[PDB]
Amino acid sequence: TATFHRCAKDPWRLPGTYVVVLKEETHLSQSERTARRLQAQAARRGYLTKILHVFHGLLPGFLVKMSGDLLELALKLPHVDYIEEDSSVFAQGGSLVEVYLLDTSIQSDHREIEGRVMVTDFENVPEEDSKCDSHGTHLAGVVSGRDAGVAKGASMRSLRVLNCQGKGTVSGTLIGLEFIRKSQLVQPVGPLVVLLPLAGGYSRVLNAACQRLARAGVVLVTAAGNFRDDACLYSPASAPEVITVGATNAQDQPVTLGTLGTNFGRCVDLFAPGEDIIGASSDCSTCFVSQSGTSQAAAHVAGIAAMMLSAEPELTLAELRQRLIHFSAKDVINEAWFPEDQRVLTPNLVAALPP
């Protein structure tokens, strides 16, 4: 029957907030009723509950702020597939394509991206424990920047899911991916590229939403993560039908980020430039800064995909992935940087545009 899951990274868990995921074909009316039933049953037991959101489109279910004491009861509700405790996520040509970015707030009026980025009204960020938009402005510059961008012809839509300290939530990200799906149904356009330059621990629900969006025909590009670890233990990096990007440097070496660095393993699809990446600084309207990480690496691939899909708009996700792999530089990465058993498992590929 129905199961409970919470982040395996104890400091990244957010107790007291739960994502109740219902069976695939559960209707929104059934979902709203299940949430009301939960509030009623909890009230009977002396518990105060609050329904924060009701999902529909990608995943059926709701978000509830309640005591964990209520989970045995919540698991017994009808249509419940699984429940997941909320957890933290952290910041880590092309003209026919819309590039969606789920990140920090962005400085839209930056000369590098002015006119190329449409700041949506979406914001779902956890409270905080030039700086607020450093991560997002740089990445938007990497994707479509005037002087230093990959896909200058690409237009972008930005959603805020990371706060001023680059911290978000799984729930926040789910609502953002649902918002993208809703925006597309209301006002369909061409091929969609969704950039996720963030990571948390393995999330069954975040992976599920990512697979639903992927089956719906959306292309999802993510950071492999900066934990010098196997990407399969991180989300949305572990979601199989996503394009999970690792970071390489100018010397064909996997990137070192402090005492850590790029993630690796059978979940990474390929690597891309993620060290000393010049791009837009949000310090001033014409400022540029060098930044590093799998986020930067992912932004390059989001640019290469945005261009491949604009040149060949009918490519399926499966076909686009084979194109990305076919056009990558092969066996240039120093495998000796990776742990021994991870070498045969880690794709030795550096992203590249068709010549």
Binding site: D147, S281, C284, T286, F288, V289, S290
Partner: peptide
């Protein structure tokens, strides 16, 4: 280092 312009970055690099 934060460059105040693209030209500033080009002279530096």
């Amino acid at each position: 280092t934060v460059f105040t312009s693209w030209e500033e970055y080009l002279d530096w690099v």
